[PDB]
Amino acid sequence: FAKLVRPPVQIYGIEGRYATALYSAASKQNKLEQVEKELLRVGQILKEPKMAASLLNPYVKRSVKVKSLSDMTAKEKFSPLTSNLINLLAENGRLTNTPAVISAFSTMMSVHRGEVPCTVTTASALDETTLTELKTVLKSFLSKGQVLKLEVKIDPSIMGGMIVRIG
């Protein structure tokens, strides 16, 4: 068996069944953030195009899935007991699905002990707290100028479409 852990993010199923494993596996031993900032650097040294198709080549033939990161980033110490799960991902073909594991992992990994919202007619109200609407009043203390009518707008809509909606 294992033990379920989730520090905020948190998807459940389809990579989210997966993330919640290394979530208890990295959070046990607490190599979690050491592997976040690992996985973050790897999020782009992977995603590239010197390779569009040489660190994420899946196939032209299988050989990549034999090992290409079981061997090219186990060519990196990066990922040194979480590079086993990338080797699984490399064999198991989900190697293009990593962006949502790492997004789950990092919007996981910050916000991993944090809270994001966005109410009505704000939109960058998107942060990492432990308490709420004391903090988003602190965003109205950026200046209450600039907010709750733009970015995303009480103009047509909240307020403006509601008097149209009564008819």
Partner: protein, 127 residues
């Protein structure tokens, strides 16, 4: 694969590398259990159609050797059976007691008493 390796009985350590467990060859973990179908993780050189033994004292047969797991027909219950359960091979596909000495003997399909005549004559068993 999917879910059964986002299954972190497996996965939660495969990360780490860490694993070492059931043979997953000759043993399995019950992946799912419902309906006397134990999707049993592992088992892959299990005899095909092998009657196995459960970590519930029951037999099942590892019928479908699927690439990850084994669809194991449970020769019985499933409440009792739980996930992760070790399914240990027995090695063995069925043989049944055979002889010619069941003449006067009422059995369960396995070639064993249900008569309540105690046990039957079959000194032999036969695949």
């Amino acid at each position: 694969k999917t879910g059964t390796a986002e299954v972190s009985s497996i996965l939660e350590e495969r990360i780490l590398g860490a694993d070492t467990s059931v043979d997953l060859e000759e043993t399995g973990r019950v992946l799912s259990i419902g309906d006397g179908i134990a999707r049993v993780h592992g088992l892959r050189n299990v005899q095909a159609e092998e009657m196995v033994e459960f970590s519930s004292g029951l037999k099942g047969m590892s019928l479908n050797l699927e690439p990850d797991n084994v669809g194991v027909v449970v020769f019985g219950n499933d409440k009792l059976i739980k996930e992760g359960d070790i399914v240990k091979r027995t090695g063995a596909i069925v043989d049944v007691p055979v002889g010619e000495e069941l003449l006067g003997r009422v059995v369960d399909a396995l070639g064993n008493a249900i008569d309540g005549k105690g046990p039957i004559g079959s000194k032999a068993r036969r695949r």
